[PDB]
Design a protein around this ligand. Structure first.
Ligand SMILES: [Zn+2]
Length: 42
């Protein structure tokens, strides 16, 4: 209802908490996080 809803921030990591105005440092940040990730999976 009235919980602010203002000040929309860029890509904010939902694991540690970090905003990334750019669309590069964020995508790359997911690597160090995602312990497992390959072609066979996903
Ligand atoms: Zn993070």
């Amino acid at each position: 209802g009235s919980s602010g809803s203002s000040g929309e921030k860029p890509y904010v990591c939902t694991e540690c908490g970090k905003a990334f105005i750019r669309k590069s440092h964020f995508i790359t940040h997911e690597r160090i996080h995602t312990g497992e990730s390959g072609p066979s999976s996903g």
